[PDB]
Amino acid sequence: SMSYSWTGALITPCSPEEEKLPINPLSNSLLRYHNKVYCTTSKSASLRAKKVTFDRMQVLDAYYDSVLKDIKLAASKVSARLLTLEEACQLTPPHSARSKYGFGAKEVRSLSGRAVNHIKSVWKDLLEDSQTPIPTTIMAKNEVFCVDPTKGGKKAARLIVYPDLGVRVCEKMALYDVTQKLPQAVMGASYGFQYSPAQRVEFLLKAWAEKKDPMGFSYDTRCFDSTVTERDIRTEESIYQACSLPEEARTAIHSLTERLYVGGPMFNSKGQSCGYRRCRASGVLTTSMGNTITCYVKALAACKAAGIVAPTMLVCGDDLVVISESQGTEEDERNLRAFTEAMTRYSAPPGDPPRPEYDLELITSCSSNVSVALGPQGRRRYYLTRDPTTPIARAAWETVRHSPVNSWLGNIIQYAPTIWVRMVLMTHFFSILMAQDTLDQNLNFEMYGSVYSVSPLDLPAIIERLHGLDAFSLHTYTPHELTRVASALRKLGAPPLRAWKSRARAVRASLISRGGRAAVCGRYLFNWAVKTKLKLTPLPEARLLDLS
Ligand SMILES: CC(C)N(C(=O)c1ccc(Cl)cc1Cl)c1cc(-c2ccccc2)sc1C(=O)O
């Protein structure tokens, strides 16, 4: 019932935390320098704790039972296997939090004796004990945002809850295969984490077009992880158990469910007993899959209870969008409140109350929205974009504080066709790379299921294969997109687009002078920066394929 119980001990940091940069070399233009970026820290952990701690009142109904029945039948169609200890170790990222048992990710990836033996006892313990809660560490996340004076004060840090490295590897052995198959099997096209930007755009355009009179809305659950109940989490296990699994996997899955997923004790970085959790833990293997399926079940049942007409939904964890047949504004709003009231009963109360949308460009899904622009031939071309405030705020931060994994590279790749990536991020970072003289250096970035390594000098080929040549010729963006980008730059205290356009010229010429791949990057990535455009032909793009 209560999402959390606290002892009073503080959520302590592990390393000295930095909340502001000494100098922001992106929010700078000769006579106008600013620094409105900030990073969340332990200091606001108590504030977040207060926010996520509340009573959950859950009451299900026939609409829910029905949808749950359908989902379990769909789940019975899946077969999954145990992952080999070796396979689970190999899936352990290079720097994931070390264990308190004398080893780190390095030792797990190389299968050192100490690590392997420890992992084996943890697995054996899971098979022998299905009751003893597994301890978790709770910590404040350090994430970068931009102050938004109008929308409110700085955001409190998100809280991360995760078990020891040894337990994490065992989770993969028992459930990794399931996480790669179950969501799509029960949700199909509605499973949002299966689409590339072009496919996501296509799904949305298609869903919108099939309605005679389309109406969409995004539903935002206030603190989704805190809203999922113990019942929800055991119900997730019953959905997992519907799959065809080896008895050994079933045992570990039940143990992991009763000892970890359903809840458990939390300790701060100092080892002090911090509290007890009775909701979703942010740092466990099943978080993404669990949230996605549970959000889908509740959302679909709510659609039925509210009488939403012909709903086509897209779900990304707790992020949900529903596009259906409009019944007129008056009726749509009535239907949306019924939907909300149903979601609430299912323990999925709304943060920002949902409102009907009748312009596709204004609907945000999985943090993005569809927009339109013209191709070199003058025809319309759709693409995925998003508010650039946070991506740029972080790009600025990662300019000073070099981090192992860059977010800017990821944003450039995922949003390559956007005007903000093209005029700002590409111009800025290629200028920085030439200044540091590290152009061909391979960098690591993330697309949330992996950490990739790529050389910026390979961006034109990567972008072509990912978004097509049109990514280098898009023009005539919408005023909504232009206004949003311009507003983000103001909030950030960064130079306006007209200034970046001037800068792009120099960056382009500098890249060309260097010849080679650098020249290709210049001619292709910045063809928008010169009045007399170069032609631009297909590249050796037909030589690669991505997973994420
Ligand atoms: C109207 C022309 C001059 N234009 C472009 O050619 C252009 C297209 C794509 C990219 Cl990535 C960059 C540029 Cl400069 C455009 C200039 C714009 C602009 C420039 C400075 C401030 C605000 C908007 S918006 C815009 C467009 O085609 O949509």
3D structure, described in words:
It is classed as viral protein. Keywords: NS5B POLYMERASE GENOTYPE 2a, non-nucleoside inhibitor, Viral protein. The assembly is monomeric. The entry is titled "Hepatitis C Virus RNA Polymerase Genotype 2a In Complex With Non- Nucleoside Analogue Inhibitor". The chain is α+β, with helices and mostly antiparallel strands and 548 residues long. The protein has 2 domains: 1-367, no CATH class; 368-548, no CATH class. The protein is 44% helix and 13% strand. It has 19 helices and 17 strands. The protein has helices at 45-52, 62-75, 85-90, 105-109, 113-128, 165-187, 197-209, 224-227, 230-240, 247-261, 287-306, 329-345, 389-400, 408-414, 419-436, 459-467, 479-492, 497-513, 516-525; strands at 4-6, 28-29, 32-33, 37-39, 136-140, 144-146, 159-163, 214-220, 264-267, 273-277, 312-316, 319-325, 369-374, 380-385, 405-406, 443-446, 451-454. A 5-stranded mixed sheet has the order 1-10-9-5-7. Strands 8-12-11 form a 3-stranded antiparallel sheet. β11 and β12 (319-325) form a beta hairpin. α11 (287-306) packs across α12 and α15 (419-436) packs across α18. The ligand CC(C)N(C(=O)c1ccc(Cl)cc1Cl)c1cc(-c2ccccc2)sc1C(=O)O is lined by residues 419, 422-423, 474-477, 482, 497-498, 501, 528.
Strand order of the largest sheet: 1-10-9-5-7
Determine the fraction of residues in helical runs and give it as a percent range: 40-55%
Structural class: alpha+beta
As a percent range, the share of strand residues is 5-15%
Based on Cα principal axes, name the global outline: globular
Provide the gyration radius in Å. Answer: 24 Å
What is the terminal-to-terminal distance? 37 Å
Number of domains: 2
Bound molecules: the ligand CC(C)N(C(=O)c1ccc(Cl)cc1Cl)c1cc(-c2ccccc2)sc1C(=O)O
Oligomer: monomer
Number of strands: 17
Count helical runs.
19
Largest sheet entry: 5 strands, mixed
